């Protein structure tokens, strides 16, 4: 432990954007934390982004407005940013920087965990093979989640992604036919969304078992950089030390990526596409990759990041890099929300990389993979038929195309469309899948092998 009296420097040299460029620092440490007493007594925090001799560039989390040159005082904590973590964090509400905002006491730490975490040794990382029964048909039957997955919800402004995430929270559970401790971290969200999620976890009895980090739209921008890391540090304490099964939700990774862009633009770092920093892949990886099971420890961390595709464009750097990093994406579609389908999940661009082992014989049922693949194929062909009928019209379609159109209609009506409080078991979802695939003769279900068709098709 650090037994030395920390140094307080009033030697600010320059201030520029979110950066206070301190001078005459003695043995500065990169990534060290600094506590800034402004002239008027207001206290802020900052992270040393760069050290050069006796200089130290402190990126202030709350912003540099009001910072003086001769009067601001900066005490150097001598240590990287550490979060106090204890199981008591379950059932609390903290703000973006981990300070309680529920009129409870500051966390009485069980440990002081580095906010940045450490990468799990890929040799001792255990592959997620246990299925979460989210209850959503569009997920369980066709994008099955595994306990330990990074599977964000790709959505857009105004879409139901909040409702889908809350539903997944309330009805997520293993397909054994234990409760998830939830760590939620909202960034740049509006008070409406903060109230929505808090009131949901209270409407359920879950709030006793939920930890919330809140960084509202009016809260500091630079603090959204550390809010995900606080949440995931708490999740890692719970999962890899307390052996909880933790579900981590990170709301508006878009409002995180924009904070990252602001910091990188202030630093004038090399930009990627559409202005975002060059290392956004690495940074979003540092966030997302803090998920999955581990060897010898019974806990897990299931992430469901929620990010608003800007202009509904999946190629935008945020969704693109999140798709590269994460093990899937559940796609929320305006073209379904406009038709008032809930959940408006577009299975066709949805994906779940760990389905391939979360489903099969043993866990869930042995027709799961065949049904999923054939539903995907039939849905794609139904979209093709819809596209062509707009050109040629109904009068020029063959009976096979009409079969595909009927399948598409009944598939969105019965399979996708679902009650916001309805928990369909994987078996109910698969039975619906078969009731839809029976629209077709065996010969047009070209994915399913005959050993599966002759066993499940007739019923």
């Amino acid at each position: 432990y650090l037994s030395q009296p920390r140094l307080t420097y009033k030697t600010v040299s320059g201030v520029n954007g979110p950066l206070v460029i301190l001078d005459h620092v003695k043995f500065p440490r990169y990534a060290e934390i600094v506590h800034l007493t402004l002239p008027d007594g207001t206290k802020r925090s900052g992270q040393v982004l760069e050290v050069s001799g006796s200089k130290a560039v402190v990126q202030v989390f709350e912003g540099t407005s009001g910072i003086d040159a001769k009067k601001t005082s900066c005490e150097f904590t001598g240590d990287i940013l550490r979060t106090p973590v204890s199981e008591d964090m379950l059932g609390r509400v903290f703000n973006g920087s981990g300070k309680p905002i529920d009129r409870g006491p500051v966390v009485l730490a069980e440990d002081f965990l580095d906010i940045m975490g450490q990468p799990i040794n890929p040799q001792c990382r255990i592959y997620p093979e246990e299925m979460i029964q989210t209850g959503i048909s569009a997920i369980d039957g066709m994008n099955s989640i595994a306990r330990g997955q990074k599977i964000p919800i790709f959505s857009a402004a105004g879409l139901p992604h909040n409702e889908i995430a809350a539903q997944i929270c309330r009805q997520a559970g293993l397909v054994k036919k234990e409760n998830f401790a939830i760590v939620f971290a909202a960034m740049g969200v509006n008070m409406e969304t903060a109230r929505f999620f808090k009131s949901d976890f209270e409407e359920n009895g879950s709030m006793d078992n939920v930890c919330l980090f809140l960084n509202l739209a009016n809260d500091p921008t630079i603090e959204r950089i550390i809010t995900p890391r606080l949440a995931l540090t708490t999740a890692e304490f719970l999962a890899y030390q307390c052996e909880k099964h933790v579900l981590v939700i990170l709301t508006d990774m878009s409002s995180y990526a924009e904070a990252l862009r602001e910091v990188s633009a202030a630093r004038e770092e090399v930009p990627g596409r559409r202005g975002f920093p060059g290392y956004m892949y690495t940074d979003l990886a540092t966030i997302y990759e803090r998920a999955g099971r581990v060897e010898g420890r019974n806990g897990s961390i299931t992430q469901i990041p929620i990010l608003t595709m800007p202009n509904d464009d999946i190629t935008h750097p945020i969704p693109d890099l999140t798709g590269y990093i994460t093990e899937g994406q559940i796609y929320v579609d305006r073209q379904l929300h406009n038709r008032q389908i809930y959940p408006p999940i577009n299975v066709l661009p949805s994906l779940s990389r760990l389905m391939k082992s979360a489903i099969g014989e043993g866990m869930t049922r042995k027709d799961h993979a065949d049904v999923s693949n054939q539903l995907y194929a039939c849905y794609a062909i139904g979209k093709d038929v819809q596209a062509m009928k707009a050109v040629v019209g109904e009068e020029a379609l063959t009976s096979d195309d009409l079969l595909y159109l009927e399948f598409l209609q009944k598939f969105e009506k019965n399979f996708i469309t679902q009650g916001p409080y309805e928990n369909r078991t994987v078996y109910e979802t698969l039975d619906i899948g078969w009731q839809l695939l029976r629209i077709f003769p065996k010969e047009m279900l070209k994915r399913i092998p005959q050993s599966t068709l002759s066993e499940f098709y007739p019923r």
């Binding site: 592959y127 690495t282 803090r290 661009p349």
Partner: protein
Amino acid sequence: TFGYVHGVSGPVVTACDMAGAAMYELVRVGHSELVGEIIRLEGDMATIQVYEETSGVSVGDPVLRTGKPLSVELGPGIMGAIFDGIQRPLSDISSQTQSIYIPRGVNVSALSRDIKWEFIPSKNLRVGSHITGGDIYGIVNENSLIKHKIMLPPRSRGSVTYIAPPGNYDASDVVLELEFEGVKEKLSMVQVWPVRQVRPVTEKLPANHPLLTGQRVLDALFPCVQGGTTAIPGAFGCGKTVISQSLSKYSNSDVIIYVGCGERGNEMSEVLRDFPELTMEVDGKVESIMKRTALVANTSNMPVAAREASIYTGITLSEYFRDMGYHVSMMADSTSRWAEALREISGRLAEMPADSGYPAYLGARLASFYERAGRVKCLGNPEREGSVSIVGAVSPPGGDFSDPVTSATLGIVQVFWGLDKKLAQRKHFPSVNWLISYSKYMRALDEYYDKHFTEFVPLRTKAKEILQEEEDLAEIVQLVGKASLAETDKITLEVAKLIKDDFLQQNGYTPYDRFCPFYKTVGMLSNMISFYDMARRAVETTAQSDNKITWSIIREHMGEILYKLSSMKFKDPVKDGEAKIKADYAQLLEDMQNAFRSLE
């Protein structure tokens, strides 16, 4: 001996008192001694890309100088191991620390010095014999598959003075002794090679033998060759990692290195879970392919600067096992991640960028990396021939191939298995886009095809013609509708659909199509192309008649035959023997001919 850290800005660090430190020398930064490599050298200050997170490093920290470049310990104990970017064994770290993390600056050795390996010296060597770089002076029975040939290092030569008797030696034991110009050199089983320097070869032969994947669209339309360079550009979710892992599981390459460069962490555990259970039969005995697979993992969230080290270490290990005379195959899980690492380091250096921020030397780096791939006549006296195939997946941002990384990589590589997000979405896996993809080895390979699989060359030519014709018809059909199509054009469309659905797309996660032997592939294509030929003959010979045969009449008459052509894929090569599969395909051909004769 020591420099002092003068500044920290990320992976880049600047150090005082580094008076004569060479470019790309290897240094230890910090009290934890994070490894790092000098990349600029101004005044008496060196700039260092640190291969481990520098958060916590402070000005004044020591920067110890090791006078050696980034190098790897090449020796027994590689196969079946998983290494981090700079060749620290992750299993050894886990055993030593008994913790689930990679402590910063852990200094564990790359190869165990405690395991006793059986050593059988080359029988002909004796004290006094002349020996040169690449010469094999013994063999280690590392495991059932890999007879690990110990070789003199390149740049080592002279007269032998002691060759260790056959027996059990640990990697630190002196196994050979030689002398040149009177200077005496003791050689253990382990050599050290700088990863940035090409391991020399006597010659680089033409690549003339295919690298059989398990994937039909790859083996047939776009072949790669042992010693060939390949790329797999595709947007996220197009299955490039799955193609790489299937090529790693099932291929005719004696050794495989999977260089895990900056991609998802769970995939290395996927490999470590799958490969031990996957087995290949050698001498009638089943052996796990992990005994011939080696892994280098630098996942996305592990230090960025180490992705470059991961790539170079992978290619160096592959070159080592190529020097043994093996046909190694290296899978670079994403070279765009390494390109992004170069971009980030360049930004920290404040260099002027090329397109989209990449350094001007990105093309040169990619070229020098891919150029280490050819089939070679290995160094040393026992005349040996090896290969290092390279399969570098590319992760173009936004799923477009105008990306600078993909543009360069396509300027460098010889095979391009472009993947299509719109096929991946439909689940048309493998998502190879058959129109833009290509393989420049299709000529070098015909010498092999025309004597092992004679008919396959014309079969492939006609298949590509069919698909191109269907592509031409797609635009007309979309804007005019199917009503205008000729009767032969209907058959082209429908047989193209048959090839797409039942020859090209191959579900790699099923027993029947995880591996599709080339005999199965050529037989399947022969059946489909033969159906195409007979259908066109039937339509063309009766189009002038009053009793015209039409695609509708064929479809109605041959529902069973079309479904059999669609079910050909389901045949299981191991549950159903080669003999049964070939017999069944011939029987389907007979059925098709019978039905055509009974229809016309």
